[PDB]
Amino acid sequence: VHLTPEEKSAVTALWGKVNVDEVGGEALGRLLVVYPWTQRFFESFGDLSTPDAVMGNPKVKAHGKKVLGAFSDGLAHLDNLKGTFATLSELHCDKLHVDPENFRLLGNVLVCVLAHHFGKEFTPPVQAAYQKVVAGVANALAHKYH
Amino acid sequence: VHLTPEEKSAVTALWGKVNVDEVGGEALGRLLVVYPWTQRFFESFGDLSTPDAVMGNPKVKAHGKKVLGAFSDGLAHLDNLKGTFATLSELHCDKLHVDPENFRLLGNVLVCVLAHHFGKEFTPPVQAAYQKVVAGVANALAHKYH
Amino acid sequence: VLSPADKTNVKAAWGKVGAHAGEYGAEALERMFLSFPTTKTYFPHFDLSHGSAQVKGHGKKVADALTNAVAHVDDMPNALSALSDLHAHKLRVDPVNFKLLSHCLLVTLAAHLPAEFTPAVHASLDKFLASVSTVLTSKYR
Amino acid sequence: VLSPADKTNVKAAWGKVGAHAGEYGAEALERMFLSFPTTKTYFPHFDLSHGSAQVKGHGKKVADALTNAVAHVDDMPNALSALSDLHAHKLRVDPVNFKLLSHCLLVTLAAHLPAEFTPAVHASLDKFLASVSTVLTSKYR
Ligand code: HEM
Ligand code: HEM
Ligand code: HEM
Ligand code: HEM
Numbered sequence: 036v037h038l039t040p041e042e043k044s045a046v047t048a049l050w051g052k053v054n055v056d057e058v059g060g061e062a063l064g065r066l067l068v069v070y071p072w073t074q075r076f077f078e079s080f081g082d083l084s085t086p087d088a089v090m091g092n093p094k095v096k097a098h099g100k101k102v103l104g105a106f107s108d109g110l111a112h113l114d115n116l117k118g119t120f121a122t123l124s125e126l127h128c129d130k131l132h133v134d135p136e137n138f139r140l141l142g143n144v145l146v147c148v149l150a151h152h153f154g155k156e157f158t159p160p161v162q163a164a165y166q167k168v169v170a171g172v173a174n175a176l177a178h179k180y181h
Numbered sequence: 182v183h184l185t186p187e188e189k190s191a192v193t194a195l196w197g198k199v200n201v202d203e204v205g206g207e208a209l210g211r212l213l214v215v216y217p218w219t220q221r222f223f224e225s226f227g228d229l230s231t232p233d234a235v236m237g238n239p240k241v242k243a244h245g246k247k248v249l250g251a252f253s254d255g256l257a258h259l260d261n262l263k264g265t266f267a268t269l270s271e272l273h274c275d276k277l278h279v280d281p282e283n284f285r286l287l288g289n290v291l292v293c294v295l296a297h298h299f300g301k302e303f304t305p306p307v308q309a310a311y312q313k314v315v316a317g318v319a320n321a322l323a324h325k326y327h
Numbered sequence: 328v329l330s331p332a333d334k335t336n337v338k339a340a341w342g343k344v345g346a347h348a349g350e351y352g353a354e355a356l357e358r359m360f361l362s363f364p365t366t367k368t369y370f371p372h373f374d375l376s377h378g379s380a381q382v383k384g385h386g387k388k389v390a391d392a393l394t395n396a397v398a399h400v401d402d403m404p405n406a407l408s409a410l411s412d413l414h415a416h417k418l419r420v421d422p423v424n425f426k427l428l429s430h431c432l433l434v435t436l437a438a439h440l441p442a443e444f445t446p447a448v449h450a451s452l453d454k455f456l457a458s459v460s461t462v463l464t465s466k467y468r
Numbered sequence: 469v470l471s472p473a474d475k476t477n478v479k480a481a482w483g484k485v486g487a488h489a490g491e492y493g494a495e496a497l498e499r500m501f502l503s504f505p506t507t508k509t510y511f512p513h514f515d516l517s518h519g520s521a522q523v524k525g526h527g528k529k530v531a532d533a534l535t536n537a538v539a540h541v542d543d544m545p546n547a548l549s550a551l552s553d554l555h556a557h558k559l560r561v562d563p564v565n566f567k568l569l570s571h572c573l574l575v576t577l578a579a580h581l582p583a584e585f586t587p588a589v590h591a592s593l594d595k596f597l598a599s600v601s602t603v604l605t606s607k608y609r
Binding site for chain 3: 071
C-alpha cells in the first residue's frame with residue numbers, strides 16, 4: 036500500500052486516538068453480529084447468542100485487541116504488509132480456511148466503527164485513505180490464496 | 182497450479198476434444214447472457230439484446246476464440262500463470278477495471294460449457310482438475326489487484 | 328429477483344429432471360466435495376467416499392428441497408423457513424459455499440441434460456439457485 | 469430476507485434521516501467516488517467535485533429512493549421496478565458497485581447517527597441495503 040505523506044499523516048493521527056482496549060472488540064463483535072456465519076470460527080468463545088452477548092463477551096473483547104494490534108502492525112510498515120502478515124496468512128488461509136471475502140468485510144466493519152467513534156472528523160478523504168489500508172491488510176491476509 | 186499426473190492427463194485428454202472455433206464463443210456468450218452487466222464491457226459488439234442474438238453474434242464468437250486461446254496457453258504454463266498473464270492482467274485490471282469476481286464467473290461458465298459438451302466424460306475428478314486450472318487463470322488475471 | 332419467464336424456465340427444466348433429482352443431488356455434492364475440498368468441513372462425520380450411501384441419501388434431501396422451492400417459487404422464504412434456520416442459524420454456513428454448490432448443480436444438469444441446458448435456461452437456473460441461496464443464508468424469524 | 473426486527477430497525481433508523489436526505493445521500497456518493505474511484509465511470513458527464521450541486525441533487529434522489537424502499541419493504545421489486553430497469557437493464561451496473569455504495573451509506577449513517585447505529589441496527593441496515601441492491605441489479609420484467 037502506498038499512501039501519500041498527507042494520507043499517511045491523516046491515518047496515523049486518527050489511529051493515535053483509537054482506544055487500544057476497545058475498538059478491536061467493537062469491530063470483531065460487529066463482524067459477528069452483522070455477518071453471523073463468521074461465528075462458526077469462534078465456537079470456543081462462549082456466548083454469541085445475541086448482539087448484547089457478543090459485544091459483552093470477554094473473549095471477543097480480548098481477541099479484538101489482537102486484531103487491532105495486527106492492523107496497528109500494518110500501519111507501522113505499510114511498505115511490507117505481506118511480510119508482516121505472512122504468519123497470519125498461513126493461519127487464516129491454510130489452517131482455518133476463512134473465505135477471503137470475510138477479510139474485506141472485517142476491514143469495512145472497522146471503517147464503520149471509526150466513522151461511528153469520530154463522527155465528522157472521519158471525512159471522506161480520511162475514509163479513502165483508510166480504505167487503502169484495509170484493502171492492503173485484507174490482500175496481505177489473503178496472500179496464501181493468491 | 183499443480184496437477185497430479187492423473188489430473189494432467191485427464192485435463193489434456195478432454196481439451197483435445199474441444200472445438201477451438203466455438204467453445205470460447207459459447208463461454209463468452211453465456212457469460213453475457215447469464216451475467217448481463219458484463220455486456221457493458223462489450224458495447225461495441227453490436228446486438229446483444231436476446232440470448233439468440235448474443236450466441237450468434239460474430240464478434241462474440243471471434244472474441245471468444247481469443248479467450249479460449251488464453252486458456253489453452255495457460256494449460257501449457259500452469260507453473261507460471263502470473264508471468265504468462267501479466268499483459269492480460271494489466272489490460273483487464275488497470276485499463277478496463279473489470280471487477281475480478283467476473284474472472285471467476287467466466288471460468289465457471291467455461292466449466293459448464295465443457296460439462297454440456299462432454300457429459301459423462303466430464304467426471305467429478307475431471308471437473309476438480311479444471312477448477313484448479315480456471316482458479317489459477319482467474320487469480321493470474323486478477324494479479325494487479327493483489 | 329426472478330422474472331416471470333425465469334420461473335417458467337426453472338419449472339420446465341426441473342420438471343425434466345424428474346425422478347433423477349436424487350441422483351443429481353448426490354452427484355452435485357460429490358462434485359462440490361472434490362472440486363472445493365474446504366466444503367467438506369461442514370460434513371466432518373460423513374462418509375464422503377465415492378459411492379457413499381450417506382452422500383446419496385443427502386443428495387436426495389437436497390434435491391427434494393429444491394423441488395419444494397420450485398413448487399413455491401413465489402413464496403420461498405415461507406416454504407424454506409425451517410431450512411433457512413438450519414443453514415443460517417444452526418450451521419452458520421458461509422455464503423460462498425452456496426455459490427460453490429449452485430455451480431456444481433449447474434454442472435451436473437449440464438452434463439446430464441445438454442439439450443435442455445440452453446443459455447436462457449442456464450441463466451434462469453443460476454438466478455433461481457442464487458435466490459434459494461439468499462433465503463438459506465438469511466435469518467428472518 | 470429481512471426479519472420483522474430488521475424492518476422495525478430500518479424504519480426507525482432511516483426515519484431519522486428526514487430533511488437530511490439530500491445531505492446524507494450526497495455524502496455517501498462523495499465517499500464512494502473518492503474511496504473507490506472506479507465507480508466514477510458510471511457518471512462520465514457529472515461534476516463530481518467536492519460540494520458539487522449535481523452530486524447534492526443526485527444524493528437526494530438516492531435517499532428518496534431508499535425512503536420509497538422502506539415504505540414498500542415487503543414488496544420491493546414492484547416498488548423499485550423503474551430503478552431496476554435503469555440500473556440493471558440500461559446502465560448495466562456491476563453488482564460490486566452496490567456493495568461499495570452500501571458500505572458508504574453505512575459509514576455516512578454511522579458518522580451522523582451515533583445513538584442509532586447500534587450493532588443490531590447496523591446488521592439490519594446492511595441486510596436492507598443488500599436487499600435493495602439485489603432488486604436494482606436484477607432483471608425481472
Ligand atoms: C481481516 C483482518 C483480520 C486480522 C487483522 C486478523 C488478525 C488476527 C490475529 C492477530 C489473530 C491471533 C493470531 C495468533 O494468536 O497467533 C487471529 C486469529 C484468528 N482469526 Fe483473525 N484476523 C482477521 C480476519 C479474520 C476473519 C474475517 C475471521 C473469521 C471470519 C478470522 C478468524 C480467526 C480465528 C478463528 C482466529 C483464532 C481464534 C482462536 O484462537 O481460537 N480472522 N486473527
Ligand atoms: C477470466 C478469463 C478471461 C480471459 C482468459 C480473457 C482473455 C482476454 C483476451 C485474450 C483478450 C484480448 C486481448 C488483446 O486483444 O490484446 C481480452 C480482451 C478483453 N476482455 Fe477478457 N478475458 C477474461 C475475462 C474477462 C471478463 C470477465 C471480462 C468482463 C467483461 C473481460 C473483458 C474484456 C474486454 C472488454 C476485452 C477487450 C475487447 C475489445 O477488444 O473490445 N475479460 N480478454
Ligand atoms: C441449494 C442449496 C442447499 C440446499 C437446497 C440444501 C438442503 C439441505 C437439506 C434438505 C438438508 C437436510 C435437513 C434435514 O432434513 O434435517 C441439509 C442439511 C445440511 N446442509 Fe444443506 N442445502 C444447501 C446448501 C448447503 C451448503 C452450501 C452447505 C455447506 C457447504 C450445506 C451444509 C449442510 C449440512 C452440514 C447439513 C446437515 C448435514 C448433517 O446431517 O449433518 N448445505 N441441506
Ligand atoms: C442503494 C443503491 C442505489 C440506489 C437507491 C440508487 C438510486 C438511484 C436513483 C433514484 C437514480 C435516479 C433515477 C431517475 O433519474 O429516475 C439513480 C440514477 C443512477 N444511478 Fe443509482 N442507485 C443505487 C446504486 C447505484 C450504484 C452503485 C451505481 C454505480 C456505481 C449507480 C449508478 C447510477 C447512474 C449512472 C445513474 C444515472 C445518472 C444519470 O446519468 O443521470 N447507482 N440511482
